[PDB]
């Protein structure tokens, strides 16, 4: 729910910059000369940078060799096959390259197998410059590197077609990371609607980095493989390390946890990595059932958690959510619902995004104003009307300025 606080930036800026540098009318000839009879050279452009070139498909040599018997005045004398083989099988790749780049209009979805083959990608990985550490990290995970790389058409020239290929570069490895989930929490007042609900919005990914923590709030854009996470810092917020205290304590003074409030109560569930959390409210039926022993437990009204040990399916109302089967150890921690510690009358109803401290301050101001108004209202009945301004020295009898005759 924290998607608006993110920054907005560009992704293909570097490729566009390289492509723009590749239009100086001399660079392309320099590349062609420097890759005259060898592959995978290192070149320096007029911009003063050092980039890596690579030739993957060669057609000038084969066409020059096999066109003379076909183009010359030989009356197109069919000779044998392996002329159709060596040609019909070749041009399909270029046809598909034009295919994808025409459909996508320039930048294409994750480099397709047709733009780059696995052997070509691995030979490029060796060619690419970087520390030896980042080889096994992204040589066993090509299927996920392909989804994190763009591809930009750049230019066509005399006899050369060249397109820039982005490739993600990994800087931080092996720091501890953790996922955070949330669930609705409400009271159970008998009168429908009168209840109050609060939730935490800090759900997402947390990763320690350089003494701070990077927080990713779009959990749909962070990939998981075995026990390793994979997503860029483009969608990250930088937070101080103390925010982790919100996990263990909810009223710590070092940092303020993020919550939101509402007055609508519904029953739902979330599927964690190793268990299922269920918030069951109202008269809707809730049931966690094994695949073999049938129903095993009925949840009462409120929030509850189940570990996947001996659990196969969960049902709330009419839905049905399965559960993961990873092997791990959970640990329930008992406690009391904090919602029991708030007065229903002065509770804030609607808050799109606020801190617990902000809610406490608003509540304090509210009841302070109420008490100030009631104490002043407690002084009502302690005031009389004003005597006439005509100079009469009357007396305050029966709350009125009557002529002084009771004791005079």
């Amino acid at each position, epitope marked *: 729910f924290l998607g608006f606080l993110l920054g907005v930036g560009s992704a293909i800026a570097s490729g566009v910059a390289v492509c723009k540098v590749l239009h100086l009318e001399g660079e392309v000839n320099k590349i062609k000369s420097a890759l005259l*009879s*060898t*592959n*995978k*050279a*290192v070149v320096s452009l007029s911009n003063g940078v050092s980039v890596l070139t690579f030739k993957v498909l060669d057609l000038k040599n084969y066409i020059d060799k096999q066109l003379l018997p076909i183009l010359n005045k030989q009356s197109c004398s069919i000779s044998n096959i392996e002329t159709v083989i060596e040609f019909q099988q070749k041009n399909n790749r270029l046809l598909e390259i034009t295919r994808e780049f025409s459909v996508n209009a320039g930048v294409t979805t994750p480099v397709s197998t047709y733009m780059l083959t696995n*052997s070509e990608l*691995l*030979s490029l990985i*060796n*060619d690419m*410059p*970087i*520390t*030896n*550490d980042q*080889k*096994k990290l992204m*040589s066993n995970n090509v299927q996920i590197v392909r989804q994190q790389s763009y591809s930009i058409m750049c230019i066509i020239k005399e006899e050369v077609l060249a397109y820039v290929v982005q490739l993600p570069l990994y800087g931080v*490895i*092996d720091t501890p990371c953790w996922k955070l989930h949330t669930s609705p929490l409400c009271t159970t007042n008998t009168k429908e609607g009168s209840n109050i609900c609060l939730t935490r919005t800090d759900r997402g990914w947390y990763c320690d980095n350089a003494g701070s923590v990077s927080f990713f709030p779009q959990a749909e854009t962070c990939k998981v493989q075995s026990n390793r996470v994979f997503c860029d810092t483009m969608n990250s917020l930088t937070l101080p390390s103390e925010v982790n205290l919100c996990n263990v304590d909810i009223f710590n003074p070092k940092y303020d946890c993020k919550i939101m409030t509402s007055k609508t109560d519904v029953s739902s569930s979330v599927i964690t990595s190793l268990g299922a959390i269920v918030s069951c409210y109202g008269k809707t039926k809730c049931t966690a059932s094994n695949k073999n022993r049938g129903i095993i437990k009925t949840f009462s009204n409120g929030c509850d958690y189940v570990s996947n040990k001996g659990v196969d399916t969960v049902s709330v109302g009419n839905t049905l959510y399965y559960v993961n089967k990873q092997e791990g150890k959970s640990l329930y921690v008992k406690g009391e619902p904090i919602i029991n510690f708030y007065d229903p009358l002065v509770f804030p109803s609607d808050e799109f995004d606020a801190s617990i401290s902000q809610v406490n301050e608003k509540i304090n101001q509210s009841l302070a104003f109420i008490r100030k108004s009631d104490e002043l209202l407690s002084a009502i009945g302690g005031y009389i009307p004003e005597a006439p301004r005509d100079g009469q020295a009357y007396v305050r009898k029966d709350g009125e300025w009557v002529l002084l005759s009771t004791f005079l």
Partner: antibody
Amino acid sequence: VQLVQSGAEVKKPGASVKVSCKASGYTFTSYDINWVRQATGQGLEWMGWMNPNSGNTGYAQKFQGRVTMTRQTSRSTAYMELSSLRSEDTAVYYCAREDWGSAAFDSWGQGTMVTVSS
Amino acid sequence: IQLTQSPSTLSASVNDRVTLTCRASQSISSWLAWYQQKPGKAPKLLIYQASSLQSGVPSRFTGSGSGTEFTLTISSLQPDDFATYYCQQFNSYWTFGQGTKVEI
């Protein structure tokens, strides 16, 4: 750039040895450390690599399960510990720096000879 | 991968152009390395990137080739060059090669 190795050491068969390599003249964590050995009258044989920035290690197949590479950033010094040393391991060991922008070993230490014998 | 120096040993005289070949058997990328190891000391960089000269070396040494064969060439043999030369790579692990000695 300079790399300094410890002096020659002698150990009994089956024992363990530890060779130190202290670096100077550059940023310690920006380059990877490699270990190579040369038997007398024989060609070079690569042993393994140990990245100082992350601490990850990669060992050759022929030496798997016997070698351990460690790091001390505060001293900027790497350590190679070889266990279960056999008679054939009598040779000289080098510690060298590999360069990420160039695929090559640019700096080599003086070398340390270790003799194993009953 | 397997590396092979087709010259195992070679001897010649002063002011000669000597050629050394190094061959592989798998996806070798296009990166080689030529080192010189003076006896009793540590080897040194001579050829990196398979075609680029290291700073400080005399220019008489050259290196070229692509595919499955790579050749190192000394244009003129000097008296102070009689030593051993080796071939390296980076398929995935690392691998040096048998190597040749330039005796006189």
